[PDB]
């Protein structure tokens, strides 16, 4: 009977930085995905392995909603098999992803006239993330052969960089809020079904 708390995910006042992407477990509730899809709200609503209007027919043990903010021209990296700073170092989907990627322009919420420096992304990392891996460390990144002794300096960079989101002409540079839905089946009774 209880509707799934999608409002808390999509309409959260604050969204996470992509390097510190949030995960919310959805369980024991009724999910209406078609109400989300049958709207003018989302500039990306891409599902992998399933059509969006078929989700209401299925039942899962849990649903996970991962959410964060990136640039509009980075939304393309939130897909299987992509590369670039976001896919490589911030949020990585597996090659065999089944699930949905939902995005919408959040300029009015997340940009500031002088720039919103609270949203960050990881620019440097010793290796690429594995799928669904998360890295929130802030150790100084050693880009050369001199060790950094935990202090930024020559070839020693703080690994996170700010987006500084501003209300620009091109929407590609504006912030977009992203929700990634993934659907989990365990050897256990389902707890998240569509309407009857």
């Amino acid at each position: 009977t209880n509707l799934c708390p999608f409002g808390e995910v999509f309409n959260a006042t604050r969204f996470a930085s992509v390097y510190a992407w949030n995960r919310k477990r959805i369980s024991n509730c009724v999910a209406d995905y078609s109400v989300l899809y049958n709207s003018a709200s989302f500039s990306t609503f891409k599902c992998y392995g399933v059509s969006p209007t078929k989700l209401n027919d299925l039942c899962f043990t849990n649903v996970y909603a991962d959410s964060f903010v990136i640039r509009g021209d980075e939304v393309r990296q939130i897909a299987p098999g992509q590369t670039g700073n976001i896919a490589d170092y911030n949020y990585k989907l597996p090659d065999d992803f089944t699930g949905c990627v939902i995005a919408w322009n959040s300029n009015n919420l997340d940009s500031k006239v002088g720039g919103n420096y609270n949203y960050l992304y990881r620019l440097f990392r010793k290796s690429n993330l594995k799928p669904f891996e998360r890295d929130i460390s802030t150790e100084i990144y050693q880009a050369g052969s001199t060790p950094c002794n935990g202090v930024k300096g020559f070839n020693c960079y703080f690994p996170l960089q700010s987006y500084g989101f501003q209300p620009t002409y091109g929407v590609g540079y504006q912030p977009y809020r992203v929700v990634v839905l993934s659907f989990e089946l365990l050897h256990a009774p389902a707890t998240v079904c569509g309407p009857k």
Partner: nanobody
Amino acid sequence: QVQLQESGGGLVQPGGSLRLSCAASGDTLDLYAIGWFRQTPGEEREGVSCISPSGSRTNYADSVKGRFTISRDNAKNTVYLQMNGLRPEDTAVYFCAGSRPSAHYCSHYPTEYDDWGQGTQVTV
């Protein structure tokens, strides 16, 4: 993802008409929005018209409002752009592009589209 191919471009006298076609191969168009963009030499692509996956929302740039009409045929997996009252300002390479947004969404923003055609030349 689809592959898109534009057709129907060519030379036209000022005041005439053209009907561009955007044929999709691979996927069906059921889940795709389609947008029409144009690009003059050395310039940036200007969104001109779009249609949502549902076909319920069509948006037009102010420069073409009233003279251009976009439409979709899911059975043929083709989207059309009817161009009436063509002025020499409308001369450009015309591209169609595809995206998978929510059912009633479509924009004129190039960065919100994934799949692009090669374009066809319209000369007024």
